[PDB]
Amino acid sequence: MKLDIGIINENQRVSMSRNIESRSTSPWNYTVTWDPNRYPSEVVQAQCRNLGCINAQGKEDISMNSVPIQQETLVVRRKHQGCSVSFQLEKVLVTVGCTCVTPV
Amino acid sequence: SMKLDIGIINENQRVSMSRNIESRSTSPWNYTVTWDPNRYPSEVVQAQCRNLGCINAQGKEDISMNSVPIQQETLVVRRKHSFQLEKVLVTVGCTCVTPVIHHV
Amino acid sequence: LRLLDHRALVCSQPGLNCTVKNSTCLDDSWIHPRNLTPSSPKDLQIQLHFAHTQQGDLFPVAHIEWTLQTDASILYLEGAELSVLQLNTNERLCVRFEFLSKLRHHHRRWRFTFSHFVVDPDQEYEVTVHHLPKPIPDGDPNHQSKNFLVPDCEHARMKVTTPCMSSGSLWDPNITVETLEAHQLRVSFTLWNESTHYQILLTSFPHMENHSCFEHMHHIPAPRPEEFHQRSNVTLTLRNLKGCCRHQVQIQPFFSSCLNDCLRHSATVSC
Ligand SMILES: *[C@@H]1O[C@H](CO)[C@@H](O[C@@H]2O[C@H](CO)[C@@H](O)[C@H](O)[C@H]2NC(C)=O)[C@H](O)[C@H]1NC(C)=O
Ligand SMILES: *[C@@H]1O[C@H](CO)[C@@H](O)[C@H](O)[C@H]1NC(C)=O
Ligand SMILES: *[C@@H]1O[C@H](CO)[C@@H](O)[C@H](O)[C@H]1NC(C)=O
Ligand SMILES: *[C@@H]1O[C@H](CO)[C@@H](O)[C@H](O)[C@H]1NC(C)=O
Ligand SMILES: *[C@@H]1O[C@H](CO)[C@@H](O)[C@H](O)[C@H]1NC(C)=O
Ligand SMILES: *[C@H]1O[C@H](CO)[C@@H](O)[C@H](O)[C@H]1NC(C)=O
Numbered sequence: 001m002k003l004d005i006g007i008i009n010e011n012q013r014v015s016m017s018r019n020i021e022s023r024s025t026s027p028w029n030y031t032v033t034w035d036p037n038r039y040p041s042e043v044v045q046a047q048c049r050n051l052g053c054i055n056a057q058g059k060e061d062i063s064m065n066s067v068p069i070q071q072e073t074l075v076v077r078r079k080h081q082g083c084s085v086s087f088q089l090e091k092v093l094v095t096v097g098c099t100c101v102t103p104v
Numbered sequence: 105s106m107k108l109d110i111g112i113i114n115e116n117q118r119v120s121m122s123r124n125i126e127s128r129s130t131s132p133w134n135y136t137v138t139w140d141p142n143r144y145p146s147e148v149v150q151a152q153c154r155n156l157g158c159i160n161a162q163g164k165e166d167i168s169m170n171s172v173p174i175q176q177e178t179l180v181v182r183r184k185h186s187f188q189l190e191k192v193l194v195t196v197g198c199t200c201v202t203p204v205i206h207h208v
Numbered sequence: 209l210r211l212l213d214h215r216a217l218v219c220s221q222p223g224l225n226c227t228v229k230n231s232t233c234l235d236d237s238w239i240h241p242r243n244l245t246p247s248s249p250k251d252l253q254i255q256l257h258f259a260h261t262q263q264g265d266l267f268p269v270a271h272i273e274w275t276l277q278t279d280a281s282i283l284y285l286e287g288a289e290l291s292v293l294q295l296n297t298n299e300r301l302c303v304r305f306e307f308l309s310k311l312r313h314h315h316r317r318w319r320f321t322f323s324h325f326v327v328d329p330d331q332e333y334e335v336t337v338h339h340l341p342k343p344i345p346d347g348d349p350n351h352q353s354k355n356f357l358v359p360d361c362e363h364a365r366m367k368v369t370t371p372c373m374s375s376g377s378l379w380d381p382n383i384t385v386e387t388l389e390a391h392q393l394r395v396s397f398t399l400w401n402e403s404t405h406y407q408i409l410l411t412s413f414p415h416m417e418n419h420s421c422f423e424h425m426h427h428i429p430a431p432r433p434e435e436f437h438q439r440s441n442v443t444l445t446l447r448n449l450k451g452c453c454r455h456q457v458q459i460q461p462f463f464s465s466c467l468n469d470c471l472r473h474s475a476t477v478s479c
């Protein structure tokens with residue numbers, strides 16, 4: 001069970017990212033979670049700023065909710081218990097942002 | 105290179121996204137399952153914005169608002185005909201953002 | 209997040225020989241960790257510079273200078289790995305410094321810079337420069353992060369950068385709204401050098417109120433290369449209503465970069 005240290009991206013974005021964190025009706029902020037034992041160290045996580053979305057007036061519309069959008073990703077976690085160092089894979093759920101939804 | 109283990113840390117993890125988020129959003133989207141046998145996770149889902157604007161509670165598309173997607177660089181292990189992981193750029197979902205306006 | 213050129217780069221300096229070796233953010237020090245690690249960097253600092261490619265185009269480049277801490281553990285340092293992390297998209301971009309020659313003294317300050325990371329215009333990034341080898345499991349950090357914020361495409365010198373020229377703040381449409389005939393308005397504005405459509409959104413509100421009496425949208429087909437930069441004129445018939453005096457007409461472009469999210473321009477008339 002050997003993992004090649006080599007990695008490559010055919011996925012270079014070549015588009016424009018956008019500062020929609022605060023322009024969203026369901027705004028959120030980012031947090032850089034850091035673990036020296038996993039790769040990559042830094043994984044950015046977002047949390048919803050409010051419980052409800054935000055109207056055009058700026059007031060919080062309680063009637064519709066601010067909710068998290070999650071993404072599955074892999075990180076390699078290294079365990080070192082003992083003299084031996086050994087790392088396995090790990091599915092972690094990064095919260096990417098928030099969207100506005102009608103409750104049911 | 106690098107020593108793998110049984111791994112699959114917290115594989116048994118359930119997403120906490122309010123079910124049917126893609127539909128109940130003010131900025132709904134479509135999920136595209138693209139399938140590959142030799143990428144893990146083997147199933148690749150990518151989201152597509154449905155409407156350029158955002159949907160009011162009434163259900164009619166508001167154009168004074170932009171509906172814009174959220175992208176993540178993510179990690180997957182590509183299998184070989186030998187295990188190596190590599191970066192894939194997934195679009196996860198959509199949010200409703202108030203456009204930016206310039207007055208004169 | 210990318211490095212404008214694939215040109216080779218210099219990190220050597222009077223007293224030090226090293227070279228810059230592209231690196232996934234994984235290191236042979238993170239796995240197979242050495243016994244004696246070096247001390248964190250100090251005085252990490254990130255400014256905003258703009259560099260040209262070999263072609264004409266120029267991008268905002270992130271300029272990372274940090275200096276080396278002054279203590280005994282310098283002997284054992286053997287490089288530094290830089291990592292730029294874009295918060296939005298969880299995109300990390302690493303390079304890595306590698307010292308061919310070790311250094312045994314601190315006689316004067318060991319300063320390092322690296323400005324070859326191209327950066328997006330409204331973006332916030334977290335640059336962080338680990339020192340090599342990396343800490344053994346359960347050891348001291350030895351790195352140093354610092355949040356970095358790039359100003360929007362209204363920055364005096366920013367707006368003139370390629371990524372802001374495309375979908376550019378350089379395109380201003382002299383916007384003319386003439387009251388004209390009652391119940392009729394003629395709008396003119398100049399247009400961009402891209403054959404992508406536009407959209408005028410005339411909404412009229414009761415004066416002193418944010419409800420709209422009348423709202424009309426007008427599609428404008430994608431301009432032919434000959435029509436680029438030449439004002440376009442649209443006459444729209446307004447609602448025959450009293451108190452429906454206040455008029456907002458905004459123009460939304462759909463340039464390839466940023467398609468749909470482009471900024472819009474609202475001119476408003478009051479009676
Ligand atoms: C998922 O996404 C696309 C984007 O809205 C939808 O496919 C479009 O269907 C609409 C309605 O006719 C058309 O405007 C487009 O021509 C279709 N796609 C494209 C870009 O060619 C679709 O509605 C969604 N899922 C489905 C199949 O219902
Ligand atoms: C790097 O270091 C030494 C001493 O600084 C220098 O003399 C030499 O030219 C360099 N090594 C080579 C050959 O790349
Ligand atoms: C990075 O390094 C690899 C191996 O040295 C090289 O093949 C590749 O061209 C480099 N990436 C680029 C294009 O900067
Ligand atoms: C530390 O390094 C020395 C020399 O490589 C080695 O002999 C020793 O076993 C190492 N200590 C550990 C962590 O086992
Ligand atoms: C449109 O003209 C050129 C050629 O397409 C383009 O590079 C430039 O960004 C636009 N003009 C201006 C004034 O920016
Ligand atoms: C719009 O008509 C205006 C004012 O009447 C005139 O200046 C301009 O030539 C027209 N634009 C075009 C090319 O139709």
Ligand SMILES: [Ca+2]
Nearest residue numbers: 019330331332
């Ligand atoms: Ca930001």
